[PDB]
Amino acid sequence: KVPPHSLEAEQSVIGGLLLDNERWDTVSEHVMTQDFYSRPHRLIFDGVKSILEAGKPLDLITLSEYLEQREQLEDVGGFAYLADLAKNTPSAANINAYAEIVAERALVRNLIGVANEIADAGYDPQGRNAEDLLDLAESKVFAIAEARTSENEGPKNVDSILERTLERIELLYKTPQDGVTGVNTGFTDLNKKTAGLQGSDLIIVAARPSMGKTTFAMNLCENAAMEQDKPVLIFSLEMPAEQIMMRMLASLSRVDQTKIRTGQLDDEDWARISSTMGILMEKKNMYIDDSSGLTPTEVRSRARRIAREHGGLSLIMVDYLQLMRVPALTDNRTLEIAEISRSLKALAKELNVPVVALSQLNRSLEQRADKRPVNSDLRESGSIEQDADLIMFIYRDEVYHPDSPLKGTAEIIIGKQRNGPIGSVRLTFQGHYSRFDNYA
Amino acid sequence: IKVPPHSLEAEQSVIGGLLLDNERWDTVSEHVMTQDFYSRPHRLIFDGVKSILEAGKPLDLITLSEYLEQREQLEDVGGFAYLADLAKNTPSAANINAYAEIVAERALVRNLIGVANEIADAGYDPQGRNAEDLLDLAESKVFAIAEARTSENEGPKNVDSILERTLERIELLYKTPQDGVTGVNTGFTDLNKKTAGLQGSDLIIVAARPSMGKTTFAMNLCENAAMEQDKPVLIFSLEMPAEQIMMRMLASLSRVDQTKIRTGQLDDEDWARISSTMGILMEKKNMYIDDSSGLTPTEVRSRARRIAREHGGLSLIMVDYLQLMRVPALTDNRTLEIAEISRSLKALAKELNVPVVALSQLNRSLEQRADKRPVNSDLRESGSIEQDADLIMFIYRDEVYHPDSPLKGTAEIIIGKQRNGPIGSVRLTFQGHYSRFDNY
Amino acid sequence: AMNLCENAAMEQDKPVLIFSLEMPAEQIMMRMLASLSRVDQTKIRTGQLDDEDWARISSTMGILMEKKNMYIDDSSGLTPTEVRSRARRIAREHGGLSLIMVDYLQLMRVPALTDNRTL
Amino acid sequence: IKVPPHSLEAEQSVIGGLLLDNERWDTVSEHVMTQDFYSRPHRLIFDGVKSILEAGKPLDLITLSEYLEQREQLEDVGGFAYLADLAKNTPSAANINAY
Which residue stretches, if any, does this entry annotate as coiled coil (chain A) (predicted)? Predict the structure, then answer.
């Protein structure tokens, strides 16, 4: 019975912190002084923790002088062991993964000790009742949960919630003051509430059939490929790359959609098609993947490959959230959508590019007779509210009502947005040639 | 020497006592089980006694021996000589209830040791189990032993204890001039007639179909509990972060339209009402919100017990979504996952003695029904909650499905199930412009 | 069912046994107090009631305390083994029973036949 | 003698190359599968590399070692020494797609 520990992983956390002091911001969230195994490794990590928390510089002699003044330098292995730790593990950036190993061994090691306490108290109760021993065993397990979850999240105090609410309200004033903070949407009305497409968050655009969810997603990619220098990546699942390019050519030249997919078109229309063809060939940013069977593993691999080849991406768009599938969760449909939503959010955090994932609403709003898409309607499809930050819906009043005042105007109603404010942004729509425009 | 906790002498007196006095089985059956007995021979004799006494009332040396002779288990026990010796060895009647409690207590301690050994063996050999996964697995094994406990010898009570409890509840109802609140005040005088205060020992599940305002009604219950009750309230946020929850709560506290807070720019008059209610919330200090998306029933019970230990005790625990919570042990079966969460939330309400308002969403089966009124049987499709939760109330506004409805701006809280008090449709007005439920 | 137990507890000398599964013993006693004093059900479960109604509830309280026959078991999880054992236990402690009432036949459950609902 | 069509030397360079360059997985995953590898030891190492690179970006001598150690497959492969020997034996990056 050897205790669960990884002495090799502890050496790389300590050794990595001496080489890169800026890693402490992430390392402190994973490992604790108690989480380290053995007395020598705990004394070194306690010195590193005490130094990096107040005095920014930490090196071979900074850590040595902290231990020398506390009569613990010889106890850890002298100056030679502290200097040989840098020689032993010179692998930076992977310190977060090494800390996770040490933290996992510690939580498993604590569980073994806690279970052994219960086992020894069962054999030798010393006047303890079965009910008393049961509550004692629960309290020992509850203690490990208290130390593990108190580092990152828990029940925040009123003062902290008031501080985080007022800072969020003040940030809403400066949303149309800064302007585009990255990816330009193309719609000046949308740029007031969105204030540029942020890279660190997931954007989910949902619409009930006939609203034009694919059309709005294509229009966002249209402006991103021309304004932003970095290329755009589109995962086609609903329709092939040929149909996507035919729809994009209609918006680029304002020529009616029907003429492109039919073939028969005027010489004037062909001149407008040929004029936009040259500008599209000079930019070279449209990368489309017409694969029907796409798994979240293949999506993340293809996005990381294209970003590595051309420096970096700018916007990743998915044609359908429900068309993607994970082979491990083929039985449970509820947890399949939640895993895809998590995988798409992780891709947006890793690549730092805005991810526009398209999704479809449930048929529950059809029997409601109001038909305005609320953020709670998409919850039926899967868990996306906790993962995606920006959730905008497409609602055109002419689809459900023929005598509607919004004739040819679809309002992009933002139902959820952490970075900026929410609201109904009216934009005109031309269904004859698939092109969303600014409402006057 | 690690000898398993057992009392072979106590098992012989339960078996021996049942042979001498067959009328003791009425009390003995409530304490001991066939599984509770230690070793194969004692379990075979007790199983025979259990099968015989139940239907074939006469039980003796010849009845017990012939039951085992026909099943080829008599020789395994020790022939007839062993069964006849148990009547001779223990001729002490009436104390059988005390001997059974010893056997039941030894079995619980023996199971606790086996449960601790399971955790210890799983720690040494995880086979791909994470530290978080192993922690939740260790808690679930301990929780199972506590589930078989909490019986407290429930039986037929006399009229003296029922009338004493009934008179004390009736006499307490005269203290309130017209409130009728036996604890947590809901804030709605119409709701206080049927609910009669939020009881702590039971689980309250509020369910509503999207667009009804389930989050709005849950926030309004926490609003009055944080101001009226001295003990703090705990809210587990899964659907929306603590910032959005505080923005919605500020709209109800000052009657300022919801749109102005989440957008930014608002009038100086509106800011004065927000600043006036800020000082009221700062003096009370009861709103504790946990904006964690990944919440397991182990982490929920640990975070509720932590706050109920720091500030003396809690007053009301609210969950944003029942379906957003997940148990790693039941990720494959969705049916038994919801039933375990419903059981864990009910156990939290019994242990902490505070009303737990768990929010849940109805199935889309009521949309095709055309009746639109959600019945208690519609939530059964989501999971087993009827047997665990005592108070189940639904939110139904007639203006959501019908535009020409007479209930314009009035949502009726229809109570479908309530063990403590009576059920019925309680009409209450609703203001969707600033998220605030009021008295009709 | 409550009205049948009402007359059996007053007329017969032997006590009555009621197995509550649908509603607790508190709700059963509140409903029984409404029939014993003819005061509207709503006033008892709400709390607010007149001084005239207070005297009728207090008068019937002493009548029920002199007889001592209502034995209620507010257990939700009741198996046929536990029902027979508790019925035999009360009939042994108090000489003998007089009427056994069950709140719900479908709420009772046998662990051996949990799969087959028909049997 | 009917010797099966295999290349143990080519399997060692794919595994060894993935430990030196984690960014190669984008192209390597398109060519090889866990089933494609010959013998039980090479399949256990490649399955660990596949499971790690698909979610947790860092993969090295101790990341792969800890995955196999927790599942009781480290000694069945050849201890830690065999995993460290693959980095030493084949230090040829970029040609992993051909292997």
Answer: none
Chain D residues with beta carbon closer than 8 angstroms to that of A297: 54
Distances (CA, A) of A326 to A331, A333, A336: 10, 10, 7
Contacts of A166 (CB under 8 A, 6+ apart): none
Q: What angle do CA B263, B265, B270 make, to 5 degrees?
A: 105
Chain D neighbours (≥3 Cβ pairs under 8 A) are A, B
Min distance B240 CA to chain D CA atoms (Å): 26
| Nearest-CA distance B129 → chain D (Å) | 8
Report yes or no: D70 at the B interface, CB cutoff 8 Å.
Answer: yes
Could you please report the per-residue DSSP string of D53-86? HHH-----HHHHHHHHHHTT-HHHHTHHHHHHHH
- For the record, the structure tokens of A322 come out as 């429900």
Ordered by where they begin, the domains of chain D are 8-99 (1.10.860.10)
- What's the gap between Cα B87 and its chain centre? 44
Own/partner contacts of B10-14, CB < 8 Å, gap of 24 or more, are B10/B99, B10/B102, B10/B103, B10/B106, B11/B37, B11/B38, B11/B42, B11/B46, B11/B103, B12/B42, B12/B86, B12/B89, B12/B90, B13/B90, B13/B92, B13/B95, B13/B96, B13/B99, B14/B46, B14/B96, B14/B99, B14/B100, B14/B103
B367: helix, strand or coil: coil
Yes or no: say if A391 and A193 are a contact pair by the CB < 8 Å rule: no
Q: For B126-213, where are the alpha helices, taking DSSP H only? A: 131-148, 159-172, 191-194
Burial class, B33, CB count within 10 angstroms (exposed 0-12 / middle 13-18 / buried 19+): middle
Give the whole-angstrom CA distance, residue B379 versus residue B375. 8
3-state secondary structure of B210: coil
Helix (H, G, I), strand (E, B) or coil at A168: helix
A201 and A419 in contact (C-beta within 8 Å)? yes
Q: Answer for the pair A382, A338: CB distance below 8 angstroms, yes or no.
A: yes
Q: Which amino acid is at B307?
A: I
Paired residues of A425 in beta bridges: A412
CB pairs under 8 A between B and D: 9
Spatial distance between the Cα atoms of A435 and A430, rounded to a whole number of angstroms: 5
Helix pair A39-54, A60-69: axis angle to 10 deg: 110
**CATH match of A176-438 with 3.50.30.70:** no
Q: What share of chain B is helix, strand, coil (3-state, %, to 5)?
A: 50, 10, 35
Are there at least 3 beta-carbon pairs closer than 8 Å between B and D?
yes
Q: Which two tokens stand for residue B77?
A: 């026990």
Domain ranges of chain B: 8-148, 161-439
Nearest chain D Cα to A296, which residue? D54
Residue identified by tokens 């182990």 is B298
Whether D79 has its CB under 8 Å from any CB of chain A: the answer is no
Site of tokens 């990816």: A183
**Beta strands B436-439; B425-431: pairing state:** antiparallel
CATH number of B161-439: 3.40.50.300
Q: What span, in angstroms and rounded, lies between the C-alpha atoms of B357 and B223? A: 13
Q: What is the CATH number of domain B8-148?
A: 1.10.860.10
Closest residue to B149, CB basis, from A134, A165, A423: A134
DSSP lists the bridge partners of residue B290 as B236
Helix (H) or strand (E) holding B120: helix B96-124
B222, B355 in Cβ contact below 8 A? no
Contact D77, B133 (CB under 8 A): no
CA distance B43 to B25: 16
Q: Is D58 on the interface with A (CB under 8 A)?
A: yes
Mutate to test the interface with B, among D71, D74, D76 (most CBs of B within 10 A): D71
Neighbouring residues of A246: CB distance < 8 A, sequence distance ≥ 6:
A257, A260, A261
